[PDB]
Every structure is written in structure tokens, then in C-alpha cells.
Symmetry: D2
Amino acid sequence: MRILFIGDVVGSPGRDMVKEYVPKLKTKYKPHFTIINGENAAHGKGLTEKIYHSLIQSGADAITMGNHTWDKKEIFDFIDDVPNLVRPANFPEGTPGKGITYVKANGKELAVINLQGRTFLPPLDDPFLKADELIAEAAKRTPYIFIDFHAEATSEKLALGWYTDGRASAVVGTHTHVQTADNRILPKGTAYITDVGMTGPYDGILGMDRETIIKRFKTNLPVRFTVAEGKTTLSGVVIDIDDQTKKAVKIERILINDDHMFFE
Amino acid sequence: MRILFIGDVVGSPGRDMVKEYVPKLKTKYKPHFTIINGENAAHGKGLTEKIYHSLIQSGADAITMGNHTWDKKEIFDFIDDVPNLVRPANFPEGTPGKGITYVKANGKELAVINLQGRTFLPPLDDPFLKADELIAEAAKRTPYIFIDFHAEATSEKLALGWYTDGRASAVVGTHTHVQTADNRILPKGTAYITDVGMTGPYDGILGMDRETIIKRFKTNLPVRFTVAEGKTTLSGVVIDIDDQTKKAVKIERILINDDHMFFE
Amino acid sequence: MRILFIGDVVGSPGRDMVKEYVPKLKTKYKPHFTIINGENAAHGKGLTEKIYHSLIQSGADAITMGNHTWDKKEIFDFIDDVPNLVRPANFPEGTPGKGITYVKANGKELAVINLQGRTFLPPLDDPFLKADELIAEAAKRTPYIFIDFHAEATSEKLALGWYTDGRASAVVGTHTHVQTADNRILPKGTAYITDVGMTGPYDGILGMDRETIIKRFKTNLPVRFTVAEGKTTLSGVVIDIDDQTKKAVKIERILINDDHMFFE
Amino acid sequence: MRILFIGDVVGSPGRDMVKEYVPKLKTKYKPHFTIINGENAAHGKGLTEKIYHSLIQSGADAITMGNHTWDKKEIFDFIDDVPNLVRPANFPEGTPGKGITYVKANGKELAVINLQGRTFLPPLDDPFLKADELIAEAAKRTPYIFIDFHAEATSEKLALGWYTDGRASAVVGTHTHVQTADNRILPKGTAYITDVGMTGPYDGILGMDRETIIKRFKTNLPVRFTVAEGKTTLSGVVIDIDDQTKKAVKIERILINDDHMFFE
Ligand SMILES: [Fe+2]
Ligand SMILES: [Fe+2]
Ligand SMILES: [Fe+2]
Ligand SMILES: [Fe+2]
Ligand SMILES: [Fe+2]
Ligand SMILES: [Fe+2]
Ligand SMILES: [Fe+2]
Ligand SMILES: [Fe+2]
């Protein structure tokens, strides 16, 4: 089973990048499952109904989210009405939407779990205990189990990866908008990467207009929230899971930008 | 000129990794300057006099530091006796030691500057204005200017890189202990990477014993400070600067571990 | 019934203050229950078995704790074996000790609950849901329910007080080591104060040596952990609950120091 | 010399309390100087020109601010144009407005300084060194020196009070919206209180609608920014400085609400 995962989509530039390159990536890699983190898709934060459908149309089988899930209130109008949208599972009981979805595509089934870290972030429920709960639930239905862990601290991300080794098929990090080079398969067969990175402006600061972000750092004064425009980048991973052993056997990084040309 | 930079050395396993591989890297790449971040070298945090000299002996020309600079109070006894130890320049005026040093090779001086980020970290002086001050001062003396920015937030690291583009020759990030894949040359010629990564245990959590760190996440109870033992890793970069144009022309990542074997 | 509560006891000076004044307060006010927060009692952090017994001897019927509960490791060997010691209830399931205790004394019964806030503190379990859970447990047995909420943020403390109004008999804040002047009875009858304050050195910074604390603020460098010498202070509240209506009818602040002499 | 200081004015209910009670307070105490913190005055955050004038109209001689100074953008067009308005002095050089002002009354001049803490807040310039700089400036012009320190952490507030003892005439804290009971004259003659409290709704959470704040704590979801309806409160202090010794000799707390009726 092959999974293609695309990191945090940031605003229209990210959406444009998805529209162009996900179909090409799908042609190139022929993944059984395609997952996209859309937490910044609506002008940099949150999601609209139109955007959810356009991301699906671009080739996503499921969409994962993060700390900005709720930033556009319109999400409350459609979240329980669409089939393949996941938000962090460790938001308190009673939160709208779901933290796990079972993606049925190309004759297979992948459990897709979204979790959010707590270091440097709001005090949600414990994602470690939540991971245990959802992994055991998922395992009753499918041995293919994928986690998008949206977190800030490298320590917390690596801890979750090691903690779930051999129990989740793959654990990929998102949130920091910078792809890491530590993609590897852990000793018990779980594919792991600390952060997949972002899809959106390449020459902003994490997708945001450079001048505003630098001004905030230098002045401590508030600035307008402004998404960058210009060159674009896409960040993703392709993960292969052995259908017999259920272990991950490969995790390859994808980067497409002026410094990493796309081939084929 | 060519610069070899080695990421956060963690404890004795990190020191062992440096002792073996830094000489081999110098043979392979023949850098004019070698810089090592030693902030975790003394059993996970801080530095001793013997360890400083041992790192120099392994091939370092200068040692940069970070938030753990002062964790072993012995440092106050030797900081005035060692010649090329740099700590974050933005600690308050009156802090022992220095934030910039100059090393010379093949007729050219390299200014080596250490700065520390403030997001998710203590409120030091502003590293942006400090960078301006030190860049201006160094530029009176040499156009070759290297910054090791020890910081947590990707936003802050990228902001500094872009902010100093064309003024610093290279800006590399440290602190998170995970190497990033975003090594690039910015438009005005500054080499940049968000985090070089760490040198030390490969199968801990950021160098720390896995069990202890996972227990702390799950229990919220204190745990003993325990550096991991086992497989090791080294993370670094090799940066080339064109000495005619003063622009960086290449930044290559170095990873040495069981997933990235070293070849002479 | 009447409750006497004494705020965070800090080190030996705090213990000395308790030894001298708690017996005098008990004579003056004749409380049915006396509760003391002991979280800093052992040289500024944690609790030893010897000090637990000493606080009981001085007149405490129950001892509540806080973020420093685990700092003196001997607590792991007595916390499960002594009566009426509680730690914050919202540490994860499996944590040693109890977060609720039932005190029978001077003829009546009181449920004493300890909780810890999460703003500016570690990500424990949600204290709001935990408060619901423990109030419902206590309300199977007794209508008299007291909460010591150990928290940093005024917003979080007030929120819990208002949230539990009419359900808890009294909710008092601890942790910031400064008594607040906002003692009041909330509309549904719950006695409330944002912070009771501390018991210990009066001329330190929250109990700590002034020069060490000031140095840390000015230099960002490490300093010795040192409990302050000199004048001492005690902070507390006395709360009256109507035995028929269950409403609190008075909450009076106690301050004993050079600026607030004690009158027998 | 007598100073009347009014704590954070929150929204229209805060403005209503000021309009009614500041004149009554000025009649009762006959202060030479009246200072109001207006940082939340414009619908809960920031300050408009109209409100600036209305606070002066109500009896203020000088207005101090805090972390919300910049929230109503019109402030950028009047801050440099009106008298006796100050913002935290430790915003970086080049920030609009000023951090110190001199108010004249009778034959006396009062230096009014505003500073902002950094613990749990943005990384501004160090307020300790900034205090040193401004006190030294002020002392050449007048021995009457007042500091409004807008900060979250009790340790930081107390540290500044003690640090400046005998150099500032008075140091009062703001920002946490809860009045503290620790008003005192420090050993070298500086009047001190950790937090003066707020002026605005009494039955909100720090002035905000209770149900919205409780919801945010329980759900971790966004809530609308809503100033609370209902009964109101005013918080202040009255400080006396001996005109011969220049020591503070008294600091009295003011509370006006249903639990503290106003006389005269
Ligand atoms: Fe994102
Ligand atoms: Fe995010
Ligand atoms: Fe490090
Ligand atoms: Fe570090
Ligand atoms: Fe305490
Ligand atoms: Fe505490
Ligand atoms: Fe305020
Ligand atoms: Fe404030």
C-alpha cells in the first residue's frame, strides 16, 4: 500500500500548487491513498466548503487539519456534512467533526488519524493516550494506520513516533512549515518524519508576507495578517507499506520548487 | 572559501561521533573553516574546559553555543582563557564571554557570530538588531560572515535568514536537534538552513533516553535527566562561498548514521 | 461550619510561621476544618514526610499541594500511606496519591479537592471537566465541598470559580504567592478568592532571595535556588458555610506580618 | 503629594464607572495627581481619541497603557499629538508615542513612567534596565516618580518593585485585572502593590462575558470577544508621598462594588 501525503496547504498559492502538482504526483507514484493537510487553505487559516471540494477534486482522498481548523466559522456549517475531513482527535469530547476517518480507495482501507501537540500550543487532551485509543480502534478494521501529528516541538513529535512504533504504520509531523530530513523507518516498522513541510509561497516566512513578519519581530507591534505571493513550493512524502508484513518499507520526501525541479 | 559546520553535540556519544567523523569530513571536503555547536557537549548541557579543547583537537576552529551555555558553572572559570568560544551575542551587556570571533584561513578571515532566538525561549536582547550591529562591525573587517542562530521557532529562523540576506554570508539554525531539508541560497546570495540538526544519540529523543522522555509526556511527572546510549548520528552542512562575488554558491547537508552511511 | 485555609507554605520560615500562628488562629476562629497548602514547604519545593506530620501537628486537618508536589522524591514513598494529603486531581490516571479527600472532624464532613491550572503551566488533564467529575463524586456523600485551585492565570481561576458556583461550597486560588483582595461570595453561594497568598518570607520575591531573582531577570543567567531570610508573613482565609442553606455567608482574608499585626 | 491611580478601564462599563466615581474620589481624597490606565477602554482593548479626551474630562491628569495600546489603529494618528498619554517605555526605539510624561500640579511635578513585563508576554526590551534609564532621567527633574508596570507574573512585578525601592516613589502593577492585597511601603520608602485591579464589569471574567470565557476553557474553540454586562466595579489606589523626605508614607486600596460600597 502506497500513501502520498501533502503538507500544510497555505492560501491560494498553495491551492494552485496542489491543483497543478498533485495530479502529476499521482500519475508518477500511483498512490492508493492521497492525504492533504488543509489547515491553512482558506486565505492562510481554516477551510471553506468550496476549498474542501476543490482539494478533493485535485486528487485528495482525505483532508487533515490542525490548530487553525476553526478559524473560519463557516467550517461549522459543513464539517459534519462531508465524508473525508479529519481534525485533531484530541480536541475535547463534543467537538464537531471527527479525529479519525477510514479512507476506502483503490480496493483498500487506510485509517487516517489527526492529532495536535500540546507543547507551545493550547492544552488539548493528551495526544499520547488519544493515539492509543484510536490505534486500537483502527486495528480492529485495518492494519494500515496513518497519523498526521500537528505539533510544534520536535521532542513531542519524535516521542509520539517512537511511542507508536509497530502500532501505527506511519507517523508524519506537520505544523512548522519546514520539511525535515529525518525521514526513516523506525525499528518496529513505522515510517516517520518530524515535519513534512508546507505547500504554498516559497519566499515568504512560512507562507506569510516577509515584510510583515520581519516588522513584527523587530517592533513587537501588531501587523496585518498577509499571505505571501510569488514563488511557490510543494512538500510531501510517499510512504510504502508492505502488504504482507504490514511494516513500512520506504518513506521518500517530495519537494517541488525552484531549487528542486519536478521530473516526469 | 568552504565552511564545515557541525550541529549540536550531545554528550559523550556526540563527542565520540565528532572525534571519529570530523577528521574524516575534513579529509573529504577540505574545508577552510570548521565550526561546531557544542552547547550540549558536557553530558547533555553546557561545556567544560577539557571538552572545549577536545572539540578543537577533533578539528574545530570555533565552537558556537546556545541556551545551555551556562548550565555547567565551570564555564565561568575558563571562558576568558579560551580563544574561539562564542556564546549567543544577545545575552545582556555584561555577560561573560563574547558573541563574535574571527578565524583566518588561506588569507581570509571568517567572522563567526552566535545569536539566540526568543520565541519559546528566554527574553534576551533582540537578535535582529544585534545581528545588524554585529554584521556592520564584522563587515568593516571582512565580507565573510557566518551566523549560527540558536532558536526554536521556524518563523524566527527564516525571518533572520531573509532579514540578513546579502549581508551575512550564511545563516544556519540550531537548537531543535532535527535537520531540515530546506537548505538553499537566498536571492541576495546568503546560504541558509533552518536547522542543521544534532550530533549524538540517533535513537533517543533529541539525544535523550526515550523511556524518560515518553514517560514525561504521558505522566506530566518529573524525570531524571538522562542522555541516551546506543546508535549515533552526526548532522552538519558544507557551505561554499565564492570569494570573488562574496555570494554563497552551495550548501550541502551532511548526515551520518545507520540510514546514511559515510563514504570517504 | 467554618473553614480555615492557609496559603502556600514556603520553606522553613513558612513552617515556623505555621507552627506559631496556626494554633493561635484555631483558638481565635475555632474552625471546624483547617487546610494548609504545603507545596513549597520543604526548602521551597515539595513536601517531606517529616514536614507533612509537622503541618498536621500544627493544626492542619488536610494538606493540599501544587505544581511542586513531586520535587522531593520521598513523597512517592508516603503519599499513598498518609491520610488527608491531596495533590492536583488532574494529573493523569495512574499518578500516585489522591486528588480528593474526605475530612471528618470537629463533628462534620468536608470534601477537599485539589486542582491545577494549565495556563502558563504544564498540560495536565482539563481541570474544568475534572472539577465536574470530583464534585459529582463528592456530592454522592456530602454537600460540603472545598476546592484549592493551584493556577497562574487570573482568567482561569475566576472561570473555575464562576463555573462551580452553587456546586462547590468554596473555591480558593493558590500558586502566585500574592494574596488578592477580591474575596466575595458568588451569586449561587460559593465563597471565592483568586489567590490566598503565601506563608513564608515577607521580604523575598515570592519567598525567594531577592538578589537571586533580580539577577535572573536582569542577566538571563542561572541563579542559585535560595529561600529568603528575614521578616515573615502568613496568608489565609476564614470561610463560613451555613449548615442549613449550604451557602457560604462570609469569607474573610487573613494577613499576618509587620504591616498587619496579629491580635489574639 | 497625593496620587490617585485607577486600574485598567475595561470597555463602556469601565468608562461609566470612571465618569461617576473618579470625580467623587477626587472630592474625597483631593489628589494632586490622577492617573488612569486606559488600555482596555475602547470596547475592551485599545484607546480611541474620543475616549482619551473623555478620560481626561472625567478627572485624569495622565493616562497609562499596556499590551493593547495598538489595538485601535487610530492611536497612530493622535498618540504623538496629545498631552500626558504614555505607553510602555520598553517597546523598541522608534515606537510611536512616549514611555514617560511629566505632569505638573501646584509647585510639584510628577514623572509618570509606563513599563511592560516580559514573562508570559511579548519579548520587548528589558524593563529593568529601561526603569534604570528613565528613573535616572526623571530624578534630574523631579523627586516624585511613579511607575505603572503592566505585567503578568507576580515574580516580575515584585522584582521590579524591590529593584527600584528608594528610587521610584511608587510602583504599581496592572494587567491581571484582579486587585492584590499586598499594598505596602517597601523598606527604602517606595509605595508598592502587585496589581491595582480593573474598572469595569464585576461579574464577568476580567471584564469579559463569563459564558464565552468558560466555553473557551472547556472547548479550546474560538469564542467571540464580548465585554460582560451586569454590575460594575472600580479598583484604584491612593498614595501619599512625604514632601520633605520624598518617601511614600501611605498606600490605600480603593474598591467600589456591591461588596464594597462607596462612602461620600
Ligand atoms: Fe500550518
Ligand atoms: Fe499549524
Ligand atoms: Fe542543543
Ligand atoms: Fe538549545
Ligand atoms: Fe507555591
Ligand atoms: Fe505553585
Ligand atoms: Fe487590561
Ligand atoms: Fe494588559
